[PDB]
Design an enzyme around this catalytic site. Structure first.
Site, PDB file in Angstrom:
ATOM      1  CE  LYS A 253      48.680  36.909  39.052  1.00 44.25           C
ATOM      2  NZ  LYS A 253      47.409  37.988  38.673  1.00 44.25           N
TER       3      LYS A 253
ATOM      4  CG  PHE B 222      35.748  29.381  29.431  1.00 50.89           C
ATOM      5  CD1 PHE B 222      34.458  30.031  28.759  1.00 50.89           C
ATOM      6  CD2 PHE B 222      35.800  28.240  30.132  1.00 50.89           C
ATOM      7  CE1 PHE B 222      33.222  29.283  29.169  1.00 50.89           C
ATOM      8  CE2 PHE B 222      34.646  27.625  30.482  1.00 50.89           C
ATOM      9  CZ  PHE B 222      33.482  28.331  29.947  1.00 50.89           C
TER      10      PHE B 222
ATOM     11  CG  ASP C 255      34.107  36.283  37.158  1.00 48.59           C
ATOM     12  OD1 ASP C 255      35.018  37.106  37.372  1.00 48.59           O
ATOM     13  OD2 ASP C 255      33.538  35.660  38.113  1.00 48.59           O
TER      14      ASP C 255
ATOM     15  CG  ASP D  32      31.981  38.636  39.121  1.00 47.51           C
ATOM     16  OD1 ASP D  32      30.683  38.233  39.686  1.00 47.51           O
ATOM     17  OD2 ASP D  32      32.899  38.269  39.476  1.00 47.51           O
TER      18      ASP D  32
ATOM     19  NE  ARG E 249      39.182  39.911  34.414  1.00 45.41           N
ATOM     20  CZ  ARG E 249      39.250  39.337  35.533  1.00 45.41           C
ATOM     21  NH1 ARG E 249      40.467  39.186  36.254  1.00 45.41           N
ATOM     22  NH2 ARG E 249      38.168  38.899  36.213  1.00 45.41           N
TER      23      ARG E 249
ATOM     24  CG  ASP F 159      31.198  33.950  43.471  1.00 47.61           C
ATOM     25  OD1 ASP F 159      32.380  34.365  43.916  1.00 47.61           O
ATOM     26  OD2 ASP F 159      30.502  34.689  42.910  1.00 47.61           O
TER      27      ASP F 159
ATOM     28  CE  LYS G  35      35.989  32.850  44.169  1.00 45.83           C
ATOM     29  NZ  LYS G  35      35.281  34.471  44.123  1.00 45.83           N
TER      30      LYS G  35
ATOM     31  CG  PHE H  89      45.908  32.736  43.928  1.00 39.37           C
ATOM     32  CD1 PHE H  89      44.710  32.641  42.963  1.00 39.37           C
ATOM     33  CD2 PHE H  89      47.155  33.339  43.107  1.00 39.37           C
ATOM     34  CE1 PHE H  89      44.734  33.321  41.705  1.00 39.37           C
ATOM     35  CE2 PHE H  89      47.177  33.958  42.059  1.00 39.37           C
ATOM     36  CZ  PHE H  89      45.804  34.144  41.351  1.00 39.37           C
TER      37      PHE H  89
ATOM     38  CG  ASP I 293      41.103  37.756  43.224  1.00 40.00           C
ATOM     39  OD1 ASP I 293      41.879  38.222  42.394  1.00 40.00           O
ATOM     40  OD2 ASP I 293      39.725  37.695  43.343  1.00 40.00           O
ATOM     41  CG  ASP I 294      38.382  37.266  47.995  1.00 37.80           C
ATOM     42  OD1 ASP I 294      38.225  37.320  46.876  1.00 37.80           O
ATOM     43  OD2 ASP I 294      38.086  36.492  48.809  1.00 37.80           O
TER      44      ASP I 294
END
Ligand SMILES: CC(C)Oc1ccc(-c2ccnc(NC(P(=O)(O)O)P(=O)(O)O)c2)cc1
Ligand SMILES: CC(C)Oc1ccc(-c2ccnc(NC(P(=O)(O)O)P(=O)(O)O)c2)cc1
Ligand SMILES: [Mg+2]
Ligand SMILES: [Mg+2]
Ligand SMILES: [Mg+2]
Ligand SMILES: [Mg+2]
Ligand SMILES: [Mg+2]
Ligand SMILES: [Mg+2]
Lengths: 346, 346
Positions: free
Chosen positions: A50, A91, A96, A100, A105, A167, A193, A232, A236-237
């Site tokens: 974004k 980065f 990540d 994960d 992405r 996390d 995070k 935010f 995201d979750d």
């Protein structure tokens, strides 16, 4: 609105960022192949999101510096530093996605999943981080805020990595961790995070560039921005699971990865003892049927409606914090960013 | 000799480094679990190597600063900055062991191979890098060389990552790359991936701490130190295969990983067309029998004896460079380091 406006302008500057980062290729031909890899890394991994953080630096800068002090070079430094926060983001996401076990992405296969890439993407991710300080040195080295910006990016990275460590620690693979998924822990994870680098860092960088360096001013901005970043991350979750992957550009993995998601924390607060068992038997595992089971539980518990209410109340609270702490900065600075993320679907 | 001397002193300071990096635990209890993970990362990954780079900072500092200017605080800053170069090393090795698929490091299983760790070690590695700039800020922030040290560590990281990128690019898994394994390419790889951070960085940091900041002085030191680092990497490649894993603390992977090793470059220069085929059919693959085949070829080609000769000639050349470029710095500065690594078996 103002973000929507600056978006094509900001993305247009990316070719210059690439050009300048790859300009060592004439002077030292021996590194040509590495620099061609860096350009490939930058093009794949720094484009397609974004640009909220990079745009926030540009917008905030324009709103904080008297227009008569916004000459060509100044503006260029500002969008360069916006691009630094974008490279930081690049980065973190590359690394990540490996950690994960993610698949997509920003609408394409994750960099590390590309055949021929795999765990080489670890070095790739760090090169993106290195580019930040190369750009700061090339463009801002002579400015009074140079050290402040270096220290702000380094501190922001450390806080984000500490967040990432909480996390990963709260989400062991192979172990049921339900007892650890608390409101309190969730808030600590997301503060470190996401909130420092995604909300405080861009605004703080534009503040330092505008010569606003006072601790009281930074601490007031921080109060607004950290609460904004918590909100935010909750979005995201929510999006990991209930979002459209063709809109969000990413496939969710929080339930498979045993994550301390806002959704599982809310699930635990409302669960009957029987539903708690459903969660315990099904959470944090790779089986599709077990993931679907957890989703059905969340939907059975009206969690999407609970997310809509939390978001309204929290947005109101952020607006109250803006009323309390914005001065002497223009409230538009914080409002443009809140409005950019309120009700977002991606 | 002088390194041997300072070694127990230097390692004794590690508990203070750990204490200071983990002291945020009283002020922000919410990050306690992450800070307990950081201590575990530091203890596992920052201890057990030779401490050549950290010791070089301490020794060089003592030899470059007038003894009357070596007060308690000064000395502490010097060993702190030695420990920063050690943390840099720790960061690189943790990540590198993942990328190289290695098994052991410094006599124990690689961090990422520990059950419960795996690719979380990516975040771990970056936290080690973050600690460097936290220590610089805590100890050196008020010194005139603070910016110089920050920029030297950041630049050194970038050059090392560019080296790592040439290393990975020249070694694709699944593809025979024999045509790319040239003298010229080898020299470029090792210059960037090893020589800047393992030789130039520590001496340069002690120079800046001694107020020696001139470009001519740094460029002269660099000439010696880069050639030293090329020679050290040639030793490292020799040790990957012909070293005793109980002495080196690591199991070799260069042949399995298709690496542009000094050994394969030398093999190619002397190979008959038939032996070239043996190399082509056997190099860069995981099969033990294929690895043994390549080793037997190297031994058939007297490569260990060729390594002994190259090392003598190159050591003589480094000594000539010291005669040409050491002044006005004491030659002992460069000699202590050469002697620490000449003929090393680990
Ligand atoms: C050194 C590197 C491993 O450190 C970090 C890398 C990435 C992150 C980070 C921070 C915030 N969000 C993300 N990604 C999100 P996302 O995958 O985009 O949904 P999360 O996996 O937290 O849900 C990554 C934080 C630290
Ligand atoms: C960001 C991180 C991936 O970047 C780096 C990580 C590690 C290295 C590096 C440099 C020099 N030597 C090593 N390790 C040696 P070693 O495994 O100890 O024999 P190499 O695998 O080159 O033979 C690693 C360079 C860059
Ligand atoms: Mg994650
Ligand atoms: Mg993720
Ligand atoms: Mg997410
Ligand atoms: Mg390697
Ligand atoms: Mg290696
Ligand atoms: Mg090696």
């Amino acid at each position: 609105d103002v973000y929507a406006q600056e978006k094509q302008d900001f993305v247009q500057h990316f070719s210059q960022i690439v050009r300048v980062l790859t300009e060592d290729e004439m002077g030292h031909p021996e590194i040509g192949d590495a620099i061609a890899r860096l350009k490939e890394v930058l093009e794949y991994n720094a484009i397609g999101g974004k640009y909220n953080r990079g745009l926030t630096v540009v917008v905030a800068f324009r709103e904080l510096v008297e227009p008569r002090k916004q000459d060509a070079d100044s503006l260029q430094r500002a969008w360069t530093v916006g691009w630094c926060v974008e490279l930081l983001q690049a980065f973190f996401l590359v690394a990540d996605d490996i950690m994960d076990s993610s698949l997509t992405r920003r609408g394409q296969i994750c960099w590390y999943q590309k055949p021929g890439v795999g765990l080489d993407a670890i070095n790739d991710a760090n090169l993106l981080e290195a580019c930040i300080y190369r750009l700061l040195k090339l463009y801002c080295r002579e400015q009074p805020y140079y050290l402040n910006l270096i220290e702000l990016f380094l501190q922001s990275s450390y806080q984000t990595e500490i967040g990432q460590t909480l996390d990963l620690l709260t989400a062991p693979q192979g172990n049921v961790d339900l007892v650890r998924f608390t409101e309190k822990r969730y808030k600590s994870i997301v503060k470190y995070k996401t909130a420092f680098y995604s909300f405080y860092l861009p605004i703080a960088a534009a503040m330092y560039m505008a010569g606003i360096d006072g601790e009281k001013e930074h601490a007031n901005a921080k109060k607004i921005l950290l609460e904004m970043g918590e909100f935010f991350q909750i979005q995201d979750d929510y999006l990991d699971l209930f979002g459209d992957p063709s809109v969000t550009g990413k496939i969710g993995t929080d339930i498979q990865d045993n994550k301390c998601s806002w959704l599982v924390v809310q699930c635990l607060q409302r669960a009957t003892p029987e539903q708690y068992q459903i969660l315990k038997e099904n959470y944090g595992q790779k089986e599709a049927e077990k993931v679907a089971r957890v989703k059905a539980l969340y939907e059975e518990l009206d969690l999407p409606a609970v997310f809509l209410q939390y978001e309204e109340d929290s947005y109101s609270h952020i607006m109250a914090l803006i009323e309390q702490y914005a001065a002497p900065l223009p409230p538009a600075v914080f409002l443009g960013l809140a409005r950019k993320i309120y009700k977002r679907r991606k």
